[PDB]
Amino acid sequence: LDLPLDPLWEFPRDRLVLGKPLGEGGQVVRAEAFGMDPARPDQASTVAVKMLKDNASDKDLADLVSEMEVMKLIGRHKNIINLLGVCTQEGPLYVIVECAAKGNLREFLRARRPPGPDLSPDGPRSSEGPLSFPVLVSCAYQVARGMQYLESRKCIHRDLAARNVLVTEDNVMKIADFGLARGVHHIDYYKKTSNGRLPVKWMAPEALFDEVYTHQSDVWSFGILLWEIFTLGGSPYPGIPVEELFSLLREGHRMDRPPHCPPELYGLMRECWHAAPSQRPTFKQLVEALDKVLLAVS
Ligand SMILES: */C=C\C(=O)Nc1cccc(C)c1Nc1cc(-c2cccnc2Nc2c(Cl)c(OC)cc(OC)c2Cl)ncn1
């Protein structure tokens, strides 16, 4: 290709060993990288690599270039998936990002649900599941801090959801795909994903009905994500098909308070779903409110 060389970010492609596919449409693969830190040139790390497939158009190339450049602009934060390097010279375009070992937050939560109540005899910690209330609040706090950072860089996510938050080996939350092209003028609202998700159920009403996105549209989505956290990966608006969702949103319907969820947290959810965007909290306010809950842990 004739892509310009950016020495700040270029990484030698022969220091990558490509491995297992992580997603395909182009594709993302898991890889081992050697010397991502130039101070440790022989040290291995595990990364995710985005690339085009042989079919790709000039438009697909421009889209991946745009995604690479937006990640350079937005800069680094602990609670987002960060750009690590690019391979633009002498070979196919690769964009290399952090790889979160524990997968996405929806699956992380669902896999850590306590078992059913009559499966096995009681034991020393049978009343404890893996996930405690302060760790659930911390997950929410970390996503709010990531979104506050992205907002400060003028980034509207437009699909914020537990499936788009990834979990590291140390249980750090990292927002995924914040610079991904989302084709907002051609959304199939009835679309169900391969894993059963109906992404329309995370859209703020002004985005769904009026095609308007602001940072306060992402606050609505954050409220849905808070509900996913405190249902340990539940699916929003259970038992409501998309046709009925349209009708219920026009009537002001909101999800019920989940079980085992304190009123402080359902309170925050309902603030995030206030009809008027200006009457929803900001991400700065959400960070502060969740910080106070964390500091009140015994
Ligand atoms: C790190 C080891 C591993 O296998 N992790 C793993 C296994 C299963 C499932 C997941 C989610 C993960 N962790 C991931 C996955 C991805 C990923 C998966 C599919 C598509 N994209 C991405 N990452 C990605 C990419 Cl490649 C770009 O490219 C520009 C931008 C992104 O957001 C900014 C993201 Cl999230 N990524 C990290 N960990």
Q: What structural domains does the chain harbor?
A: 13-98 (3.30.200.20), 103-296 (1.10.510.10)
Q: Which of 119-147 are b and which e, b meaning 16 or more Cβ less than 10 Å from the residue's Cβ?
A: eeeeeeeeeeeebeeeebbbbbbbbbbbb
3 state DSSP class of 74: helix
Ligand 1 pocket, CB under 6 A? 22-23, 28, 30, 46, 48, 50, 67, 81, 95, 97, 99-101, 103-104, 166, 176-178
Q: Which residues of 220-235 are buried (b: 16+ CB within 10 A; e: fewer)?
A: bbbbbbbbbbbbbbbb
Method for this entry: X-ray
Per the annotation, does 27 bind a ligand?
yes
Q: How deeply is 185 buried, as exposed, middle or buried, from its count of CB atoms within 10 A (0-12, 13-18, 19+)?
A: exposed
Whose alpha carbon is nearest atom 8 of ligand 1?
103
Q: Which amino acid is at 98?
A: E
Ligand 1, atom 6, residue with closest C-alpha: 103
Q: How far lies 168's CA from each of 19, 36, 165, 174, 179, in Å?
A: 19, 18, 10, 8, 20
Is 98 annotated as ligand-binding? no
